[PDB]
Amino acid sequence: RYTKEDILKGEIPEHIAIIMDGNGRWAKKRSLPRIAGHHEGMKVVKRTTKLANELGVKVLTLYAFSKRPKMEVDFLMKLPEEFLNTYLPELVEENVQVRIIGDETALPAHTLRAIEKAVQDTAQNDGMILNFALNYGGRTEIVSAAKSLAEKVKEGSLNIEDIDESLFSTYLMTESLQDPELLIRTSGEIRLSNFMLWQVAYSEFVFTDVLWPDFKEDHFLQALGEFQQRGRRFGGI
Amino acid sequence: RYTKEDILKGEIPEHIAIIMDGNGRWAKKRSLPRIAGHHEGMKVVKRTTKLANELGVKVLTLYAFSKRPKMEVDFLMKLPEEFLNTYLPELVEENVQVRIIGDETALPAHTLRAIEKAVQDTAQNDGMILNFALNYGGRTEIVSAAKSLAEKVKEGSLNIEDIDESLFSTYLMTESLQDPELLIRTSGEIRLSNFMLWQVAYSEFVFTDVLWPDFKEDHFLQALGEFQQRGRRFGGI
Ligand SMILES: CCc1cc(N2CCCCCC2)n2ncc(-c3ccc(F)cc3)c2n1
Ligand SMILES: CCc1cc(N2CCCCCC2)n2ncc(-c3ccc(F)cc3)c2n1
16 A cells, blocks of 8 residues: 555654564464474564665664474574574675664573674664564563662662653663654554563554564555554644 | 443453543534533543443553643543542442542642542442542653662662562552553554553553543443454464
8 A cells, every 4th residue: 555655755763663473373374384484584574674774764673572392492592593694794784783682691602692793793883773672571671670770779879869760761671772663563462462661651553463474565664654644643642 | 243241251351441532532523622522531431430340340440641721731630529529429339449540649639638538438348449540650650669669678678689570560559450451542542652561561452443432331342342352362372
């Protein structure tokens, strides 16, 4: 419905967050193994990155889910390395900054050292930020912020009366990131699932039935079109 | 589409939260003054309370919004008193517990003393809880929880390593309430608008274009039907 051209003439949210869901359901629909769903979603991460960056998006936060059989768990823990293997050279050429939020202690040393090198390899780029949220949880992030504030208060380098909304935001894992103007959730679930609770206080939400491996350029455009037409509504605010 | 009978044979969320929006837009549609929108929404609070309580709902959290002309601001600040005036005797007979969350210091003394008496007048009831959220904000609630935890840590009655997800929940304004299984937002906006950020981490969300003064029994049923059919879906989880 919405061509690319139409979308560009309109407003482009600086920070988009996508809850990438439905990789396994896609595989089942396809009569394919579950791991083939996750691999296909990996290629969709690339196309989304490219288009969002072409579109002038400034931050793209992609959320990958967390008790499946431990062959599948190990496989997903190796996806970052495969993705970075195949797509990092064009990520540095396309001027992307690779970044990661979440509990990093949940991944093996080898996976972290691959991730951390792609990070420092793109840190001197200044284009789009590609933020991967891994083993990330909204409530845990909030509680960890409170505990670190409590510890500075305990040590006497922070006074409780100086703890305010903006200071609290500096203690979250997204401290140097503007809040997402747009959150997209694929695979038909209409929930937040413990994702960026504090940060999406005022974000527009766009839900779609489309499964993440199917969520290609046209579907991405339609969500932007949905975002834009909300800005063109009349009446009260 | 969904009769009452159908809805009852299914599962009833124990805690529902509604973002009551669209009172003014309804008035404009009706060629009526804005304050007549707010008064009509007040009568919809009653019918929703009655039906939810008949339906066996255990907690009903209703959210009323917060810079309009100061004739309209003063008018909304007097709605609690009018509502409690007209509907409290049947709220005590219908076994409802009236409760309130939010920054109470934002209302005048007379409005608080009316609210607080309706509270203690129903405190010895044990049926449905009717929770009114007034001058309530998700982020401020979270920050106030951190500041009180910081203060017990400062005084030495709490150790930082004992601050966890469940303890953090005890410091929110909804401390003695289960998280809502269902959040409903009327008037067509698909956003949270800084409402119960921590508490809706896992809630099902139901959005509707219906304006709150129009949101009567049938529309309420359809949202429950929507809630129930999500539980009957197949595939992955
Ligand atoms: C669970 C682990 C996982 C799963 C996963 N999926 C499954 C989630 C939906 C996308 C399909 C591929 N992806 N896709 C990219 C990454 C990635 C992570 C870190 C990084 F630095 C670069 C890329 C990824 N990581
Ligand atoms: C802003 C103040 C306001 C506005 C308002 N609206 C406007 C919001 C949508 C509902 C229409 C009537 N309502 N409806 C009930 C109450 C109420 C508050 C406290 C209490 F103890 C009992 C009832 C209410 N309070």
